[PDB]
Design a protein around this ligand. Structure first.
Ligand code: AV0
Lengths: 178, 183, 177, 183
């Protein structure tokens, strides 16, 4: 599953637009040699667009059905991920001096280690602009399935057809068939 | 009615505008020069009159000529998340230097992006600066007499909501509304 | 009982030591040297006021049965409100920054603490103070409930202490041998 | 036993020393005045070597053998108090450009006073930087085969603790200890 790093690029997906705005020493290969982080962020933005297309067409396949939807509930977001991965790199990447961005980019490592769990890096509140929503679904053929938090592009009513992909053993992708 | 939805968010960020005009302004007549070196203070002042306008709108929205008297069955205090304060107000006090307009453009884009996120994830009342203007969250259950029943609605009002007293309503979405006490 | 400002000044006692170290600009000394550092003069006057309030709070209680006794679990949010943010604001070399940080002190005053439990700053624990939750029973009708004590010493069930009532929720007491 | 307590607190304040060393360090035969010019990274390097010395000391407090075996009756998770991260780490990140030694002396007094409250109020293990070195809190009801039974003690350990397994006690106060898994 190489798409696991695809969601994390799609998790940020708009911070790379901010670094283009923030660090841009525009007035030739000299201008290419003066700023490098804009080029890296542009490559990552293009990769984010490609992973968005892959996540868009990744649910359309020949997989012969998952389940009818059983009892489920909403999840909502964790704002600590948005304070960790989005505000602090934004403050790191605008200070100049070459010596403060290293400190703030180590602070984001410290917050990512000690304040949030390893598996809960997919619950980014930035991943709400692209029509995404999580529902915790108890899937019950397929078999018994519990504690599987599903990424969905629409609402999830009960007792209806749904196609599935798989992302991890905690998370997966679902699309509603009518 | 999503126009007032972004308006609650822009009302809950007026003290940020006050912090910006306090932190930024360079007051020593002058006409063009005083306008030119202070563009961020007058922009945040325009945003401040926008927030005052939306305060006037949120005060006047309740008397909508409906005269409804929906009663209260269960009510309990919700409180704010108290991280939405840290998500919008930690920015100008972490050392952000308002020197070039590129950084101010990036900051305004961050405010717009965080507003779109907070609108879409149903966290536009979660900012704890809403209690500064006076607004208390109550998880309340209205009766809606004679035409059905609702469940698990979040109400914002500037007065105390006890149990079993009829109120008005002014809905934002299907989940969030605003009441005031009948007198 | 105006002594609520007595405990508030004693709560910020070690803060005024910081501002003396921080914002003083002492290098021949004239009256001008006194008049530039007006803020250290006010902080020193408040420090002597805190010394007086320490000497007064040493013997406020002058000349009962205790039922419940639980720990209080000191809140750190009052420490983030009134201690580290004025220390941030008071060293920035221009007036607008401390004005802004004092305004944020006001904001993380009213909008966060819901200030009736402002007494529980952990700087008081430096000055030999401990907090306990108590229900009082006495032949003074014992009617007060959900009472919280601030003391220099530990308490337990049925401990003879002298009440020195402070507010609706607060008193000061020590045990009797 | 307060020496081990302030050792645990100064082990918690380790990435702050690393952050100060990163944040203020002047990168520019006779070049021997660099110790005089760069005094803050030198004293923070001395502090960092001290912090790793208390870490190496705390790694083998439980190595002291006395044939210790006590049976754990219950286990939970307490988790670090999230607010105490902001009380010791917000100083070099909410501004505070390092300057003449008056401000550094004030910051040293603030760190010392922070330690003086945090020892007295029993919130030295509450710092969440301790999980970076690897430490998981477990509220344990532990029964001693001996004089009596103890209740509601907070345990710090480098291993995961299950139900009914034996540990080694290294009591700081009567409330906390650092333990290792029986093997
Ligand atoms: C401008 C400068 C000053 C501003 C200060 C303003 C206040 C800021 C404090 C904010 C803050 C931590 C933020 C940490 C900093 C983040 C990195 C910082 C980066 C910069 C370097 C602490 O907030 C405080 O936390 C205390 C302990 O949590 C709590 O006390 C309590 O004591 C008793 C229990 O011991 C108890 O009995 C008592 O009832 C309480 O009261 C306090 O009431 C509360 O105010 C809030 O964090 C909280 O905890 C989580 C995260 O850990 C996180 O939510 C999680 O849990 C939810 C439960 O449902 C769940 O719903 C969420 O899904 C989940 O995710 C949220 O964030 C927030 O819920």
């Amino acid at each position: 599953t190489y798409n696991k790093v695809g969601l994390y690029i799609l998790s940020l997906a708009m911070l790379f637009v901010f670094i283009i705005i923030l660090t841009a020493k525009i007035p030739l290969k000299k201008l290419v040699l003066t700023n490098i982080v804009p080029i890296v962020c542009f490559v990552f933005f293009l990769f984010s667009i490609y992973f968005y297309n892959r996540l868009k067409n990744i649910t359309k396949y020949n997989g012969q059905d998952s389940v009818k939807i059983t009892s489920c509930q909403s999840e909502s977001y964790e704002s600590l991920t948005f304070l960790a991965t989005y505000i602090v790199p934004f403050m790191g990447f605008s200070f100049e001096d070459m010596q403060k961005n290293i400190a703030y980019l180590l602070l984001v490592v410290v917050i990512g280690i000690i304040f949030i769990k390893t598996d809960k890096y997919y619950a980014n509140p930035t991943l709400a602009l692209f029509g995404f929503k999580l529902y915790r679904v108890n899937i019950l053929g397929s078999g018994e399935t519990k504690n599987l938090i599903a990424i969905s592009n629409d609402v999830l009513k009960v007792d209806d057809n749904v196609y599935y992909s798989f992302f991890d053993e905690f998370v997966f992708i679902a699309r509603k068939k009518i």
